[PDB]
């Protein structure tokens, strides 16, 4: 087998020539050539079988991915493992390869406005798709967000998603970690459990955010620190707003800070589009409820140019997960018949 940075890398016969990309928890990323397709793909090594959790994200990703298909979702092209469950210790994930991601053109890279623009409507499209199955990405940040050289931008990462379930999204004070800490809305520290679309949607709009300037906007350097970068630019919520949060801690967490003006769009980012202000404002509203939705957020006049309600295609049925109960040994199992339709046989 070829072997990369120390790894074994079994993938042959179809997959030869391998470059290391990177790694991190998930495992390790290689470009590879494929002698069917003759593309280079991508191909990540997943060892996750002595984790629950990470079988978990393993099972989620391999069960959305293939059953969505849509020009701005990171496919899954093939998956290879052992052809027995007492021979699998690894999952391949074959995938189309992308020559970067938005996390590192945002450190290098001024963006356009025009790039801006173009970005923010493909994310909202892709985002359109997965809603429109009730999934909830649930982890949206630019480092899940893979662009090509003439960028084309898929949103990638899907072991962190969730079915909708807005009825049971109540929950207490400091207690959930939903999202990545930059890109997680208020209510997650407050009162939500991150089971609803408006999740996704302010993730969105810190995204928006930082495309504007190559800085994150909501820096928090710790998870309590996030409310306090939240708030410093929204400022103080509204008595309405306020008066939503039934839970007494939270809500009088929020009583006991002092009043705080919102910071204007326009002095954050004195060079962006004025269109582009007033879409980030509705994505960036405390009030979930009142938080702007996808296909809002699509016919907003920013995204004009490209806006296209019959080009902008949903899923031909929603999303059908209940795996928290389930052991890692199980969680194996289901892995190994998810990926059995990429066996020879
Ligand atoms: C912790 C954990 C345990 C078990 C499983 C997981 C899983 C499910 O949550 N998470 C993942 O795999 C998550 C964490 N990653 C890693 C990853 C690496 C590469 C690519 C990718 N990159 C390119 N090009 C590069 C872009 C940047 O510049 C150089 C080129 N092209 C195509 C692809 Cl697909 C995608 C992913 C992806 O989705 C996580």
Redesign the pocket.
Known sequence: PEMVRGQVFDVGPRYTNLSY??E???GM?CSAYDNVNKVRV?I?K?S?FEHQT?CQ??LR?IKILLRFRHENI?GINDIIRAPTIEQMKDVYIV???????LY?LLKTQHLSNDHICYFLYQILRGLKYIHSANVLHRDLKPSNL?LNTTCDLKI??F??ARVADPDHDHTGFLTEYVATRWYRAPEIMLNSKGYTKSIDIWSVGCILAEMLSNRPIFPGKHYLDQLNHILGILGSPSQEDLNCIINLKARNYLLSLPHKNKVPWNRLFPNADSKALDLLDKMLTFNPHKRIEVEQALAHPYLEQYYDPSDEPIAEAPFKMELDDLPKEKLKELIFEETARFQPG
Do not use: N, S
């Open positions: 990309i990177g991190g928890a998930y990323v991508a990540k997943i996750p990470y994200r393993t990703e990171i995938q189309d390869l992308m020559e970067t991601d590192k893979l990638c990462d072991g962190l």
